[PDB]
Design a protein around this ligand. Structure first.
Ligand code: FMN
Ligand code: FMN
Ligand code: FMN
Ligand code: FMN
Ligand code: SMN
Ligand code: SMN
Ligand code: SMN
Ligand code: SMN
Ligand code: SMN
Ligand code: SMN
Ligand code: SMN
Ligand code: SMN
Lengths: 334, 334, 334, 334
């Protein structure tokens, strides 16, 4: 019995070792961006529509050539065995069963081929490596294994300053490894090398500047994720949700525009959609569910989110995600 | 001795069982909209006028063909026997004696005919039923019983997610029933079916989008209530008070424009009026009064509100509600 | 040793009976306007000027034909014997010695003639009485006694709802009386009756609407006080400080424009001046000083305020009050 | 092991006597400006750029004819022997070793010649003295000793009202003296006297009004520091960070534009740069480090700041400080 995503955070805090909970929860620096991701969503209010036909409400979208059950995917989160022994396999199985895309990480603690074998038409998140040819090898592995999109993370020339991790002296346990292995700053040249190497849609994750969104389209990206990396990279980076509307207007249908950071309910999904998002990513809550109850926990989380999305959409007069994108919003004060 | 509406909430909390107080107080989801209803009112400041003739201050209005003693009606609140054994009869009697319209609910715990027999020229709130012909039967019953307006609630295709009720496992006590009985999403077609079935003014309750207000006028509505259902429906819905001015301008006298959500004083009534409302509805405070002291409690609440409205109007230089509608406002910070 | 006005509030709270402290401190309703008076000042920041000649900084102004030592007068506060046995005489003596105008109240607890005999070129605050001819008698008494301005309070058609006083059951002690005696709502006609009866400047206290300020000038007022009566009248009335700039622009030198509400330091005086005020009134702090230490307390308060005003002006590059009125401001967040 | 500047404040509070910590931490009046310096920075969010070449990130700038390792100098802070026995020598040595300019104060507790002999191409802060000829003597001493800029503080016609110091009865210990000695308000004439006396760039510290910035350029200043003196002068003065963008636009490259007040991280440096600053000054944190651990403490602070600046710049896609100045920002809510 979980009735909100916050029930799951409480459950995860109970079971996880403190330093692992901190690795999960924390952000960089003073955690200004981490907090602002929540602030920004809480300031948005939706102007719902009434009296529309709701006889066949559907939360489905088409994205990167696949139907998804919700306008949502599981965000790339490294090292999922930190949270539960089944790690990425548990999460991927639940995502598959829920009809939600799952993003396999470069720093997965189970190999990408094993996770892809779970099924459910998975995405692959890329960190740019030592070498162009090595980078392109992970991309080719992902494609050969049936991944359907390459989510190239562009906001990590290096890892942010995670003061909780520094203070805890946090290190990976011996029993958690980067299973895809036996990194350098990405540039626009790296993006082109990836685009030239694969037929899969390339999705640039970590875009916040409007001109970078425009350039992403010009560069041949199939999508972007408007994101400050959950407040874990530049401390003081604007929340993605605050740039989303401007970015959606600037790209003017040229690529899919996803957003992440602080999505904690179906109502938040509705807000993101109303601001123009094609879909959202959800990170920490999926890990809370994994920590609390493994695969079944993630299943329950996704069922709860699905119900909340359906509920919010219908209450707002939206029989489809497209209708939700046409909702207006108004900023309030919290 | 109650000197503010907050005195009544304190009294009601003392006497009501926790789960019933929660059914009354709560909202949907995170209660963002519930809180925002209060935030929005607290941000509004009035610019009073001075030195005007106040030799005959009157708080009366004409609405739907009846004089009312205040620019206020009792909001539809389901299942009033939850709060006091006399339930709707106690509230309706006090409203009648105060010259305030009372809204009889589809989900009243005393039959609509019994409540109408109390007198006081009552309104009837409609939820759209299984069937057009059944829906229209409640409407015809209401009209035959002397109800003077049909308040069609348009923001409940289904009930919101009330997490307090879920956590409490709340259910109606055996001794409380829907006394009008021995529901489907409404659409604009439903509104037309109702309008075609009755000579009474049809008032659409739960409008927040400006274009829905315009469409309400085009559809032949006699009024609208600009409302987020007390924060009980879409969590994240904008407060009605924040949409009110824009809606008043858009309908440009084409129907009565009421507002509700968070009205807790005569000063709040003045604010609503200054933002352009024809009248307000008041929900929870009426139930606090009912719980605290039955009919006499509701009488005392309405007397207090009447005094506060008169006081606020005169201090603001308004001898009539029309003058109060011409007051200007200015947003502050709280 | 008082180094801020807040030192005096602490001292007054220690010595005064609770219900008298509440009569002094309180506002109407929820005290929204009382709090907002402070909020509004705290949001204002000054843009100081540097490198200007400060060899003869003067805080003096000319107002209503008299030099004053500061851009400040003691606000009308009824019944000063509530706070100290010497009441109005103690305050008036200290104001005289400091070169600050003192406003004698219609509801003074010492007769206006006695207070005027203290000297210091006093003002007289008028509440409109039962009768035009009686009202005009107080005005004539004030003028005969040497009062130099009539401060006609225009925001009290009746007293606001003071919930602290209601809850305390507050009443005047037997030993405090309205010493000018052995009231009706004012209108613009009342203002004209007063203007026709006296050669003294008539100052309308309690103006908040821009058009009322304009009408005050048209009506022959020599000044206005932009004021919400210290949050004691309409609860939800905008702070005077928020209307001041707009009012100053609208009257365009046609009368003196004073402001009051929440002035608690020389820096606040500077802010008021920079927003365009001719001068401020100070109410509660003067009573704190009276309660704490009688005449000497008020002297110390006025010395402290004088020092703070001089300090703030010079730090802001202003050798005169006129220069301070030409300072720019910028709203911040607190 | 310090991982943030806040670690150093905690360490300094532990070791310093309360009244000395208060002399350091405090501001004038109600400390409104002190707090606002932090508020203003916390409201700014950066819009980072992605995918840019970061193969040679450099935090260096050229200013007043010298390379500096960071866009930062140590602010003038009087009487550094209050914080550690080595006082200014410890701080100057660490600044030299870090490649950061150090501002020698008129009220240094070690003579300016001794501090200059440490090396590191130092600046000299001037307070205007009794006499033009005396003022010019300090300037000539500074120049003869190898100081490279004259930082003329223009916001201290006299010292602000420091209520912590008043309440503590704070006075310099016998063992701390103004070592440059065995003051009057500055004006634009004083600035010209200094400019005519030295070939060194004259930098006016404490400018907040846009027209004063313009006049500084017209007066021949080589730079300005946009500053409210750390909230220690006019209480209610706008934060420098809030005026910075407007000032940068108005001077349009005519002089260097520095800012100070509340810089507490490399991210704050990035924000200042993105708002257009040439460089920042840092005051209190340098003293925290000095108090906590002397020269080595200051070294550690500067190393930490250097790392944070590099980190923030790279995460924001900036290979140089010039690129950081071209970043856009967006205000949020905290
Ligand atoms: C513990 C953790 C690890 C993460 N690892 C990665 C990663 O390897 N690659 C990546 O692109 N993003 C990574 N992210 C960022 C997420 O993809 C996502 O941007 C962020 O979690 C969204 O915010 P939310 O957690 O508030 O939902 C990680 C986030 C967390 C919390
Ligand atoms: C316990 C409760 C039951 C309600 N039942 C109904 C209902 O049956 N029909 C309806 O249109 N609104 C219903 N409402 C909403 C109210 O009519 C009204 O919109 C809301 O109470 C106004 O906000 P307030 O309670 O802040 O005054 C209910 C509200 C509450 C608190
Ligand atoms: C205890 C008390 C009594 C007052 N009596 C009067 C009055 O008789 N006439 C009047 O015009 N204003 C009266 N005022 C209002 C003050 O003149 C003034 O508007 C208010 O005190 C200014 O705000 P401040 O107290 O924040 O300085 C009174 C205020 C207080 C606190
Ligand atoms: C204890 C202390 C002493 C100071 N002494 C001087 C001074 O002698 N001259 C001067 O121009 N500024 C002086 N300042 C102001 C600083 O140069 C600088 O403007 C301020 O410290 C910047 O804010 P920060 O402390 O928040 O970094 C002093 C500041 C402090 C805290
Ligand atoms: O945010 C995170 O922790 C991941 O994105 C991450 C980034 C770099 C190295 C390891 C893990
Ligand atoms: O300023 C705006 O309106 C947007 O940038 C915005 C701000 C906060 C939340 C969502 C969107
Ligand atoms: O808000 C409420 O509780 C009522 O509007 C309500 C709505 C639907 C079913 C029962 C009661
Ligand atoms: O933005 C506005 O001014 C209005 O939408 C509004 C906002 C808050 C309260 C009342 C009205
Ligand atoms: O604010 C106050 O208390 C006075 O203005 C006042 C007004 C009316 C009657 C008595 C006293
Ligand atoms: O909105 C504005 O700028 C003014 O009304 C104002 C608001 C708050 C304080 C002073 C002045
Ligand atoms: O802010 C401070 O304390 C210094 O700027 C200062 C100013 C004037 C005298 C002594 C010290
Ligand atoms: O109003 C603005 O945008 C600027 O004055 C400003 C305000 C707050 C922080 C930095 C900059």
């Amino acid at each position: 019995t979980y009735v909100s995503l916050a029930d799951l955070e409480r459950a995860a805090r109970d079971v996880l070792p403190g330093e692992i909970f901190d690795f999960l929860a924390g952000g960089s620096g003073t955690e200004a961006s981490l907090v602002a991701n929540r602030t920004a969503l809480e300031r948005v209010f939706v102007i719902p529509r009434m009296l529309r036909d709701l006889t066949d409400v559907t939360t489905e979208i088409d994205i990167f050539g696949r139907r998804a059950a919700l306008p949502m995917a599981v965000a790339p989160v490294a090292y999922q065995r930190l949270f539960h022994p089944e790690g990425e396999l548990a999460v991927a199985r639940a995502a598959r069963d829920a009809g939600v895309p799952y993003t396999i990480c470069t720093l997965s603690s189970v190999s990408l081929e094993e996770i892809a074998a779970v099924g459910g038409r998975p995405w692959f998140q890329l960190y740019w490596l030592r070498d162009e040819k090595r980078s392109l090898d992970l991309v080719r592995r992902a494609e050969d294994a049936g991944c359907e999109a390459i989510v190239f993370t562009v906001d990590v020339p290096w890892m942010g300053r995670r003061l909780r991790d520094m203070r805890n002296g946090f290190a990976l346990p011996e029993w958690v490894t980067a299973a895809n292995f036996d990194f350098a700053p990405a540039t626009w040249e790296s993006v082109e090398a990836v685009r030239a190497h694969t037929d899969l849609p390339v999705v640039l994750k970590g875009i916040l500047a409007v001109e970078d969104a425009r350039r992403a389209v010009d560069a041949g990206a199939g999508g972007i994720v408007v994101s400050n990396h959950g407040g874990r990279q530049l401390d003081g980076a604007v929340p993605g949700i605050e740039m989303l509307g401007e970015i959606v207007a600037a790209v003017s249908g040229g690529c899919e525009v996803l957003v992440d950071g602080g999505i904690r309910s179906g109502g938040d999904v509705l807000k993101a959609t109303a601001l123009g998002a094609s879909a959202v990513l959800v990170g920490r809550p999926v890990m809370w569910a994994l920590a609390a109850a493994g695969q079944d926990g993630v299943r329950q989380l996704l069922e709860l989110l699905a119900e909340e999305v359906r509920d919010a959409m219908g209450l707002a007069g939206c029989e489809s995600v497209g209708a939700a994108r046409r909702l207006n919003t108004k900023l309030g004060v919290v």
